[PDB]
Amino acid sequence: TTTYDYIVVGGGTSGLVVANRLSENPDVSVLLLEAGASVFNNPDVTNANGYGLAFGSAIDWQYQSINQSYAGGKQQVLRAGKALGGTSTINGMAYTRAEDVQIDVWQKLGNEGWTWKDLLPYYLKSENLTAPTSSQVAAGAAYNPAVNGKEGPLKVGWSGSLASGNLSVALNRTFQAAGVPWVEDVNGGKMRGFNIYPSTLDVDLNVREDAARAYYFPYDDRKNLHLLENTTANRLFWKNGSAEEAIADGVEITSADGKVTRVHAKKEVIISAGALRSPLILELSGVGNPTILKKNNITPRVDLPTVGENLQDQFNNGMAGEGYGVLAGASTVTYPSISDVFGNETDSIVASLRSQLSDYAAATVKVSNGHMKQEDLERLYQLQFDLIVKDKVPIAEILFHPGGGNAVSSEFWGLLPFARGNIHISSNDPTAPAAINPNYFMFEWDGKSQAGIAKYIRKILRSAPLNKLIAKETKPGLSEIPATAADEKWVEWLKANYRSNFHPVGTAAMMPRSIGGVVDNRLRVYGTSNVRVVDASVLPFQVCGHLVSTLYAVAERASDLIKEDAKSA
Numbered sequence: 001t002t003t004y005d006y007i008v009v010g011g012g013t014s015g016l017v018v019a020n021r022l023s024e025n026p027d028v029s030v031l032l033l034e035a036g037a038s039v040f041n042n043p044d045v046t047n048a049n050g051y052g053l054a055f056g057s058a059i060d061w062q063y064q065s066i067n068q069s070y071a072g073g074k075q076q077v078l079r080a081g082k083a084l085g086g087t088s089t090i091n092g093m094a095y096t097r098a099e100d101v102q103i104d105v106w107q108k109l110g111n112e113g114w115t116w117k118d119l120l121p122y123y124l125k126s127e128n129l130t131a132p133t134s135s136q137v138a139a140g141a142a143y144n145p146a147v148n149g150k151e152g153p154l155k156v157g158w159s160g161s162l163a164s165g166n167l168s169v170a171l172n173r174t175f176q177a178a179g180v181p182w183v184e185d186v187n188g189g190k191m192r193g194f195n196i197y198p199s200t201l202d203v204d205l206n207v208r209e210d211a212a213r214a215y216y217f218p219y220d221d222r223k224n225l226h227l228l229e230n231t232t233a234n235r236l237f238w239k240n241g242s243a244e245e246a247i248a249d250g251v252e253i254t255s256a257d258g259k260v261t262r263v264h265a266k267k268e269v270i271i272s273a274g275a276l277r278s279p280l281i282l283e284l285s286g287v288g289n290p291t292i293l294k295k296n297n298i299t300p301r302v303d304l305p306t307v308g309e310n311l312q313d314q315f316n317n318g319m320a321g322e323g324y325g326v327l328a329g330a331s332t333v334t335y336p337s338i339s340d341v342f343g344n345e346t347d348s349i350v351a352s353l354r355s356q357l358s359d360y361a362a363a364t365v366k367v368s369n370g371h372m373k374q375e376d377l378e379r380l381y382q383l384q385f386d387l388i389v390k391d392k393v394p395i396a397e398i399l400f401h402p403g404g405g406n407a408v409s410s411e412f413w414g415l416l417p418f419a420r421g422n423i424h425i426s427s428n429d430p431t432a433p434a435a436i437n438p439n440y441f442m443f444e445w446d447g448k449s450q451a452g453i454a455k456y457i458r459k460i461l462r463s464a465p466l467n468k469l470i471a472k473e474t475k476p477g478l479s480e481i482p483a484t485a486a487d488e489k490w491v492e493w494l495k496a497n498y499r500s501n502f503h504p505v506g507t508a509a510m511m512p513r514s515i516g517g518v519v520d521n522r523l524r525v526y527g528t529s530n531v532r533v534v535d536a537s538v539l540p541f542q543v544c545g546h547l548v549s550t551l552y553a554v555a556e557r558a559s560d561l562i563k564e565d566a567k568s569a
């Protein structure tokens with residue numbers, strides 16, 4: 001009565017895709033476990049313009065970092081969705097993907113089958129894009145039909161409120177004058193440019209298109225698909241027998257009524273609890289660094305000491321200006337390259353970074369207490385360097401939107417910092433807060449690039465034709481950071497005012513085991529027969545764009561791999 005073919009732990013962005021796809025086989029039973037509950041009628045969620053409203057609420061996990069020792073010692077809140085739909089219920093709504101070559105790097109790493117060419121069909125499979133209205137088109141909204149799906153569960157489209165306005169027209173021209181092309185679609189593998197981005201929006205209903213509205217609710221009539229909400233997965237438990245290779249028997253759970261029980265999986269357990277939880281579940285299950293497991297009175301079952309290591313996140317800053325009059329128009333995204341941002345200074349910046357890569361790798365070794373090797377980190381960082389410098393992938397995202405009245409707001413983040421951190425359990429109590437350490441600002445590039453982006457935005461606000469609309473910069477403003485200001489004043493300000501960008505990846509990274517990978521190219525946890533991780537944990541490097549599009553695609557592909565593996569096994 002407690003047995004299912006598959007258990008999916010976490011009914012979030014990724015997990016709901018897997019549960020959907022596996023349950024396409026009517027003879028396969030799937031159990032979803034989700035710690036939160038439906039947010040179908042939570043207005044903080046449904047509101048197409050409600051991003052931010054849910055922060056601090058019962059549907060925000062509000063995870064907490066440790067003191068960030070490279071950024072002045074301040075701890076950072078790391079937000080995440082506690083809801084059916086996971087973090088797709090509380091996030092921003094921009095639908096953007098990744099650079100083609102940066103997905104190709106996954107296969108170069110040694111992960112067979114993971115290239116842009118191989119992933120593109122799964123982006124398409126996930127997506128149902130609604131074409132823009134005539135008025136949205138006049139404002140700049142466009143897409144390439146060849147790279148957008150029309151049949152998938154995730155509705156994508158442009159806001160009902162999208163209109164031409166002085167701001168969006170001026171930003172297009174001003175970015176073009178800075179040498180950044182207007183591009184019609186950032187989602188065909190080439191992201192560099194200025195774009196009127198689409199969103200995860202159901203335009204028929206004008207509501208947020210979260211992962212549950214996409215992949216769960218229209219399918220919840222399936223009798224082979226089962227959901228336990230308000231149910232916390234504590235750890236996996238294992239079949240007992242001298243298979244040295246570990247076989248999961250099921251998942252231990254705590255219900256809302258406080259009952260603590262087991263559910264069993266006949267085939268596989270799929271862990272989709274997010275990059276800040278999936279590794280904890282592995283550790284609590286005895287899969288991880290034996291030093292940490294033993295310290296916390298957990299019997300080691302698989303010696304896999306990079307569980308929770310290789311955490312990579314971005315950090316987010318904001319600037320603002322004031323118009324002479326009211327500012328209006330479509331929200332915009334710009335993805336500039338290193339040379340777009342740095343102009344005549346690019347060669348200097350590249351030379352400096354080049355000269356630092358080995359030092360960054362050496363410095364990263366201690367983060368994992370020696371469980372990644374310098375030589376291997378150096379090769380990883382060389383891949384990332386080549387993406388930035390040789391392929392000229394975007395190094396920044398810059399968002400602009402009207403800020404109400406005469407205000408214009410920009411938020412921005414460096415896309416590819418080199419800092420790595422980690423996350424680990426603090427006890428064997430599943431409710432105890434983890435030790436989460438992204439190491440924001442660890443390396444010079446990370447802060448120098450952020451500063452370069454900020455200076456670039458300062459310049460944009462003062463450039464034509466935008467400067468005809470914008471009276472002045474209000475944040476930071478010239479009093480706080482004078483026009484004559486050096487790189488370092490900007491870095492200090494950015495450190496004082498940043499937040500997490502809430503894009504953590506890599507804590508159960510898909511890489512060869514021999515360079516510290518946690519899952520193989522089919523997302524199977526090393527040393528296990530039948531456990532996978534399918535969520536942001538597995539991304540081995542950061543990507544340029546907004547994570548959900550890529551996680552949907554990765555989970556779509558994973559689902560096919562799981563089905564293939566069942567047929568022979």
Ligand SMILES: Cc1cc2nc3c(=O)[nH]c(=O)nc-3n(C[C@H](O)[C@H](O)[C@H](O)COP(=O)(O)OP(=O)(O)OC[C@H]3O[C@@H](n4cnc5c(N)ncnc54)[C@H](O)[C@@H]3O)c2cc1C
Nearest residue numbers: 010012013014035086087091092233274535536546547548
């Ligand atoms: C505020 C914010 C804004 C963002 N902005 C954007 C954006 O505009 N666009 C974009 O694409 N991305 C954005 N991101 C990132 C993106 O939303 C996430 O990377 C993505 O949703 C993560 O998906 P996931 O499947 O890894 O995990 P999640 O969606 O977080 O799913 C994990 C699920 O597991 C559940 N869970 C966790 N622990 C347990 C347990 N022990 N037992 C049972 N269930 C459990 C959770 O409650 C959750 O439902 C944003 C993130 C945040 C926090």
Ligand SMILES: O=C1O[C@H](CO)[C@@H](O)[C@H](O)[C@H]1O
Nearest residue numbers: 092093094316501502503546
């Ligand atoms: O993807 C994102 O877009 C958001 C803007 O839409 C930003 O605020 C979040 O920090 C970021 O995670």
Ligand SMILES: O=C1O[C@H](CO)[C@@H](O)[C@H](O)[C@H]1O
Nearest residue numbers: 316317318496497498499500
């Ligand atoms: O997290 C934050 O703290 C910053 C100050 O510490 C603030 O300026 C930003 O607006 C905010 O995102």
